[PDB]
Amino acid sequence: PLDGGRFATSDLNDLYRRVINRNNRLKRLLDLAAPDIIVRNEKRMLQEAVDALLDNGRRGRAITGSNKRPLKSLADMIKGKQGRFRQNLLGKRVDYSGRSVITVGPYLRLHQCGLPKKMALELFKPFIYGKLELRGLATTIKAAKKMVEREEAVVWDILDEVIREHPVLLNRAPTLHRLGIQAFEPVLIEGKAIQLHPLVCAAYNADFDGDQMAVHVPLTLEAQLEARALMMSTNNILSPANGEPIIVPSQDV
């Protein structure tokens, strides 16, 4: 769609239109009994149009559009680094996630992280709705929606109740080994930056000069138990590449 309530055709539609036009012209010529030197030319052009539709540029030369660039065929949709397999089926964007700048917290314990409470309020919203309806504060879903919108004084107590023993996953990119994702218990803080335990930075290859991290929420009971038993930072003191410790002091310590 464009401005003014008008639409522009995409690449697949263009290729389909070209194929249909060639097919109609060939059918009309064949029914009209034209000389062979013309029906053969139409047949060749129809073959070229179909070949362009199926795989554009593989044979001959790629047909371009208004932007002097080749059109996208079906094979282009299927394959490549921008195809379905690698862009949608092997990795994808997800809900219940955020990101922010990381700072240092020297007071934390090895199983703890520091999470801003605005991020936590946004990430744990259906849990807050459920807890609000459970204890009679809200009778309907819309009442809880309004209460969370207003940020009343009781929703912060609810938020402290829901995050009490619920782990979160912290991830820093690029993920080079499996220690690029780790599970922590959140401690609600003010400010807008995520606090990170000093002893794990070496595992993340992270430093506090502008790095950012993403945070994900596990939902079901199996995911929470997997976070507590497989991915928590207290289970990852030894490297998997060799047998040496990775959570080790450095620099100031």
Partner: protein
């Protein structure tokens, strides 16, 4: 002798080498190029003249009529720069061209002048450049970046030994024009020359020669040396040239006069050649075997039969020699070949040549250019004539011709833009010579082979590109009759030129939004060189050797300032003194050295010229008469450096900062930093944000004033005078009569810029730095722009810092900040934002901006005025209404329910819907400005009327000021003349001006002079009335908008942001970090006087990074602050001016033979007291980049302030009162606030909108998108073994729709369990695969 703006506060300089050449104007590269583009030219070498004369005259096919060009002109712009920026239009001027049409009669000799008609025609608009080298396109400032491309000419290259598996090197030679096609000559692995055009199919080399009027005999004559055969009736007694025998072994008995100098089986040596040359050996007896395989030169035919014996390019044989012996042939010609030299390549290619004559070669060329197309003679010959030899289709330019001739060693620089036979022949000969080891290949990264192209040249090229289309249209139109009334006005169209110019200026690769964080960002952007763009390289297929520091970059391109990442090495910065040739090659200045005496003559040398000399360094010590000191000096010559004697030197560098850019020249103690950290600091320095107050560095390099003044952000006095009026928003200067033009009131009015948005949505704000009644000179600073302090660049703040570890809060580049820093708003910034509401017109009626919105409460409409526009000064948050607008819903069927609704709730609520403008969610601020634009014909509202009243008052103010000055002068003259007639002194003084107007005198010339003066007074009044009327007319004029658009309203909001944990801070030495904590003031370390520190930095970041400049800067900042503290202590307990000036003179006299001389005896006591008041927060210091301050001088300055010489003091713990066990380094450092605020980084999401095809969450913060969970995160989860977490990621959180809804319902229900399904993207994949005719399906 210091200027007024410099005498207020003088920066103490530690440099020791005198300056012989001042820093040039830093924006010359843009202004010169556009001035070349726009100015009139007597010849047609540059600009619009060269483009016009490249196309015109344009004549029809029949020759009956011709269109010709005479002159062009540019009118005055409609609006000013500020008006264009405010309104949102393009600052440009109209182009007028005087064309003429001539008619030629038929049946007449040549062209008879039946009629010539000349007319001026409108060609379009041309954007103009402002005083600071920028363009205002659609109201936003833009920069066009210069490009570093390959020069035209001829270039010889070779493959490095890769194109073949044998390791043999293959050479090639390319011809590169400005316009036209490419011509490549290349060697084959079989030593066969080949010719390629436009990278097309490889063709035999001799096809080009045969296309030209050339024959095989002529070819062999050109490319080979002859050998003469005389058969003197005895074994073909041969003539020999001794040097031809080198590298060969005798194959027979070589004798002269019966002595065999070289016998069979003996190799020919140099001494044998000496013997032959001494004896003049000519007659050589050789057998037939010596002529068994030699190639015949020309064609020979028997005189008896007359038939052809042997064709050209034929190797002889015994039978052929026997046949030609009886044919009466005594003189024969052969070719000469060897291996070390004179190798056979043309003959073998002729052997491979399939063509025979010119027509065959042209047909072959036509087949190559056009595949399968049946060619003829005419098409082929026309195509080959037009390919390289037509002025309209092939241009080599003037620089291309110069380089072409200089490569082939020709004495002429001038020439034509087309090729010829001689040029191609010479190129082939040069390639052959290089093949035979008699030449050298080029270096395509040498800065003598790379040219700079600026804005004017690009604009000229685009204008010519448009002119060709206009010419085609004219030629198509001119081929008819009806000429008895035609005029050139109906002959050309503005669109084909104006469209091209607009496209180039607004949507090119090298046209970019100006970087506007601070003045340094703008200066750096305007001096940038790019290797990308049209006609340049690409980020991926560029190479590895083009991203490297070539030795010829010395003094022309900064080796330190380049963007790290993908574009490293492809984006460069200019050096401080670098210029360009008249051809576009960078050159740099040097001082000529003659007779061992370094003089003051400056010569600008380019990379080609520089390599032939011996050039000394700027570190070299000189005597007072210019002579050197040591018999050995360090010099550069032929790309290397070594020691040379005092007499072998030719030149010398002008400065020690000649090799760096502007950004790198602002880093103090650069020579003590590693290059990586210097690069990082130079990049970081230009993304700092201006704060509420400026703060001069207090440790600088002396380059701050140049950057402050040459950036254009300040207000600079155009003429000298006195400050007649000073105010927070305007300045009025009373000009000296020595500079006033005749017949004017001498006043200059400067209107300062107050709280204006920049491209990065920050504040631009000017403040006066002068006071009422003080004198100013030309070029002094009157107002300070953003990040400027009394005319110096001030990007950050001076912080008191300590280096020590503090409980893990500065672990891994974290920063601990005091609460007193926050309390004083030292790093607080202002951010401004613009929003717009457009009242349009649609099919169902016009939209209306009004305050009567049908279904909103009285509280929501509380801040809207009577016109539905928010008040100035209102505080707004998310969801508040800024402009109230309604849109017509249309008409319905009018069922009884709708009629009942109309009856009850009113008819307005049934006709319109609410479509107002609201503050975006999560945005606050204060409304500081509203601008309303109304289309003509429509009526103005109250808001627009008030705005127009304000603007009219503002204009009337200046008009009244000038009129008042002129009226006062005229009245003074009138009264002076009136007294001379005999009028009373007191009576005239008490008589008012109206009474001065009406008075009588005698019948002398006094009455006539008074009448003349009164008439002049009336004329002055009329003139100023006319000026005011015109200004009012322009102010109150209606506006022309886009079709349909009726009204436009713009609202500006302003907010203040404070420092907080997560914000990024940096210094000038590559030391960046993030704030981790804000500490209460009584927890900070304090010294013995109870003074706390502002910032604590980790000392473990210094030794591994090797940026030692920050430690020295800290020490010197401590010393400067100590000097300032002594001055402040003297000032507080009021002491005599003598003591103040004595101490300040002692402070300025410090140092080991510095070049700065400050004398306080020529200062008045007022000046001394003002200077002391400006130095009471610390004395600023300058240390040049490679001519800075030593440790001894820093220690002396520490001793002057009664401070420890080691720079380390005793600190105490604020929480316990206990002394730290070791001394700590405490000082002052210049910190910056970078534009990486955590307010713009934090983002979170639970559920939102999804894509339509993939049904997956969108991306980005501005779309409330999700985080990507790519392949590597999947691998990590697989390595852990968390299968359920991965299944949650893949299905119920991204694109399983029913699973999404059921998971949300279960979570709200208190049941944490999922029921996964199939992702939608897999179904899409199945459909896409089945659209390819492949049956893929699930089963069982």
């Amino acid at each position: 002798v210091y200027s007024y703006t410099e005498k207020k506060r003088i920066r103490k300089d530690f440099g020791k080498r005198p300056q012989v050449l001042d820093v040039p104007y830093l924006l010359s590269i843009q202004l010169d190029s556009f001035q070349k583009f726009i100015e009139q030219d007597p010849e047609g070498q540059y600009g619009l003249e060269a483009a016009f004369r490249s196309v015109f005259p344009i004549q029809s096919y029949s020759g009956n009529s011709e269109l010709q060009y005479v002159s062009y002109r540019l009118g005055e712009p409609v609006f000013d720069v500020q008006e264009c920026q405010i309104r949102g239009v393009t600052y440009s001027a109209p182009l007028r061209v005087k064309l003429r049409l001539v008619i030629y009669e038929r049946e007449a000799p040549e062209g008879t002048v039946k009629d010539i008609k000349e007319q001026e025609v409108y060609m379009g608009e041309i954007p103009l450049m402002t005083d600071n080298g920028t363009f205002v396109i659609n109201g936003t400032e833009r920069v066009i970046v210069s490009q570093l491309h390959r020069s035209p000419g001829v270039f010889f290259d070779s493959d490095k030994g890769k194109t073949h598996s044998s390791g043999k090197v293959l050479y090639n030679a390319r011809i590169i024009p400005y316009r036209g096609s490419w011509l490549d000559f290349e060697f084959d692995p079989k030593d066969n020359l080949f010719v390629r055009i436009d990278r097309r199919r490889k063709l035999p080399a001799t096809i080009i020669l045969r296309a030209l009027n050339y024959t095989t005999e002529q070819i062999l004559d050109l490319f080979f040396e002859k050998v003469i055969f005389e058969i003197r009736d005895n074994k073909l007694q041969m003539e020999l040239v001794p040097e031809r025998l080198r590298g060969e072994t005798a194959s027979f008995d070589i004798e002269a006069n019966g002595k065999v100098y070289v016998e069979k089986g003996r190799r020919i040596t140099a001494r044998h050649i000496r013997q032959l040359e001494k004896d003049d050996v000519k007659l050589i007896e050789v057998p037939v075997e010596y002529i068994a395989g030699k190639v015949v030169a020309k064609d020979y035919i028997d005189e008896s039969t007359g038939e052809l014996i042997c064709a050209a390019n034929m190797e002889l044989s015994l039978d052929l020699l026997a046949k030609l012996s009886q044919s009466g042939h005594k003189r024969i010609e052969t070719l000469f070949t060897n291996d070390l030299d004179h190798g056979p390549y043309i003959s073998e290619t002729l052997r491979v040549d399939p063509t025979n004559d010119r027509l065959s070669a042209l047909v072959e060329i036509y087949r190559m250019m056009r595949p399968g197309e049946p060619p003829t003679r005419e098409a082929a010959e026309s195509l080959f004539e037009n390919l390289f030899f037509s002025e309209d289709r092939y241009d080599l330019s003037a620089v291309g011709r110069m380089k072409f001739n200089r490569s082939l060693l020709r004495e002429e620089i001038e020439g034509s833009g087309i090729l010829s036979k001689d040029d191609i022949i010479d190129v082939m000969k040069k390639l052959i010579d290089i093949r035979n080891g008699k030449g050298e290949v080029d270096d395509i990264d040498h800065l003598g082979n790379r040219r700079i192209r600026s804005v004017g040249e690009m604009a000229e090229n685009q204008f010519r590109v448009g002119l060709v289309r206009v010419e085609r249209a004219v030629k198509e139109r001119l081929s008819l009759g009806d000429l008895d009334t035609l005029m050139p006005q109906d002959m050309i169209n503005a669109k084909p030129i104006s469209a091209a110019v607009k496209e180039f200026f607004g949507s090119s690769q090298l046209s970019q939004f100006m970087d506007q964080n601070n003045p340094l960002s703008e200066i750096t952007h305007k001096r940038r060189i790019s290797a990308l763009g049209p006609g340049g390289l690409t980020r991926e297929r560029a190479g590895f050797e083009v991203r490297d520091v070539h030795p010829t970059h010395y003094g022309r391109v900064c080796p330190i300032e380049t963007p790290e990442g993908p574009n490293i090495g492809l984006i460069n910065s200019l050096s401080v003194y670098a210029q360009t040739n008249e051809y576009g090659f960078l050159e740099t200045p040097y001082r000529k050295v003659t007779d061992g005496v370094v003089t003051d003559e400056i010569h600008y040398l380019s990379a080609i010229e520089e390599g032939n000399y011996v050039i000394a360094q700027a570190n070299s010590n000189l005597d007072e008469e210019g002579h050197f000191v040591e018999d050995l000096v360090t010099c550069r010559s032929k790309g290397e450096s070594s020691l040379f004697s005092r007499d072998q030197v030719d030149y010398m560098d002008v400065s020690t900062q000649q090799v760096v850019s502007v950004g790198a020249s602002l880093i103090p103690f650069l020579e003590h930093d590693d290059a990586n950290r210097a690069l990082m600091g130079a990049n970081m320095q230009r993304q700092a944000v201006p704060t509420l107050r400026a703060d001069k560095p207090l440790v600088g390099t002396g380059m701050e004033r140049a950057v402050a003044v040459d950036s254009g952000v300040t207000a600079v006095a155009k003429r000298g005078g006195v400050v007649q009026y000073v105010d927070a928003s305007r300045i009025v200067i009373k000009v000296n009569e020595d500079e006033m033009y005749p017949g004017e009131a001498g006043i200059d009015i400067y209107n300062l810029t107050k709280y204006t948005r920049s491209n990065q949505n920050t504040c631009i704000n000017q403040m006066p730095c002068v006071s009422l009644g003080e004198p100013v000179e030309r070029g002094d600073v009157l107002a300070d722009g953003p990040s400027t302090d009394l005319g110096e660049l001030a990007l950050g703040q001076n912080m008191r810092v300590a280096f020590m570890p503090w409980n893990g809060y500065n672990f891994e580049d974290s920063i601990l900040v005091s609460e007193r820093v926050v309390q004083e708003d030292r790093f607080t910034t202002i951010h401004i934002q613009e929003l717009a509401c457009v009242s349009r017109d649609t099919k169902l009626g016009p939209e209306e901006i009004t305050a009567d919105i049908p279904n909103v409460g009285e509280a929501a409409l509380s801040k809207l005025d009577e016109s539905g526009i928010v008040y100035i000064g209102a505080e707004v948050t998310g969801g508040d209404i800024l402009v109230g607008k309604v849109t017509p819903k249309g008409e319905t069927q009018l069922t009884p329910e709708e009629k009942l609704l109309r009856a009850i709730f009113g008819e307005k609520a049934s006709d319109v819907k609410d479509s107002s403008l609201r503050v975006p969610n999560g945005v606050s601020g204060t409304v500081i400005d509203v601008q309303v634009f109304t289309r003509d014909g429509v009526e103005k509202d109250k808001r627009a009327l008030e705005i127009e009243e304000m603007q009219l008052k503002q204009a009337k103010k200046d008009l009244s000021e000038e009129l008042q000055i002129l009226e006062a002068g005229l009245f003074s003259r009138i009264r002076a003349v009136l007294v001379a007639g005999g009028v009373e002194a007191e009576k005239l003084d008490k008589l008012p001006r109206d009474r001065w107007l009406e008075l009588g005198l005698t019948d002398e010339e006094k009455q006539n002079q008074l009448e003349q003066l009164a008439e002049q007074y009336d004329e002055l009044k009329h003139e100023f009335e006319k000026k005011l009327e015109a200004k009012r007319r322009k102010i109150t004029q209606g506006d022309d908008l886009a079709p349909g658009v009726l009204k436009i309203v713009k609202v500006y909001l302003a907010v203040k942001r404070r420092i907080q944990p997560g914000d990024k801070m940096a210094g000038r030495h590559g030391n960046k970090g993030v704030i981790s904590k804000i500490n209460p003031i009584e927890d900070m370390p304090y010294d013995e006087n109870g003074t706390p520190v502002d910032i604590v930095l980790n000392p473990l970041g210094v030794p591994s990074r090797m940026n030692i400049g920050q430690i020295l800067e800290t020490h010197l900042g401590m010393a400067a602050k100590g000097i300032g503290d002594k001055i402040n202590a003297m000032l507080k307990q009021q002491q005599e001016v003598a003591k103040l000036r004595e101490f300040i003179q002692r402070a300025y006299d410090l140092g080991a033979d510095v070049r700065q001389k400050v004398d306080l005896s020529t200062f008045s006591d007022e000046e001394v007291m003002r200077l002391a008041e400006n130095l009471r927060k610390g004395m600023p210091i300058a240390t040049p980049v490679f001519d800075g301050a030593k440790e001894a001088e820093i220690k002396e300055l520490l001793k002057l302030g009664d401070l420890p010489t080691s720079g380390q003091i005793r600190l105490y713990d604020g929480r316990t009162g206990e002394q730290f066990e070791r001394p700590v380094t405490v000082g002052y450092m210049y910190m910056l606030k970078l534009n990486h605020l955590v307010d713009d980084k934090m983002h979170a999401r639970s559920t939102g909108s999804y894509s339509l095809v993939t049904q997956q969450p969108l991306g980005g913060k501005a779309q409330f998108g999700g985080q990507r969970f790519g392949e590597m995160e999947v691998w990590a989860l697989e390595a852990y073994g968390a299968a359920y977490t991965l299944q949650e990621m893949l299905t119920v959180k991204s694109d399983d729709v029913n699973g999404r809804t059921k998971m949300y319902k279960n979570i709200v229900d208190g049941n944490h369990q999922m029921e996964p399904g199939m992702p939608e993207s897999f179904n899409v994949l199945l459909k896409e695969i089945r659209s390819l005719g492949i049956n893929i399906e699930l089963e069982d």
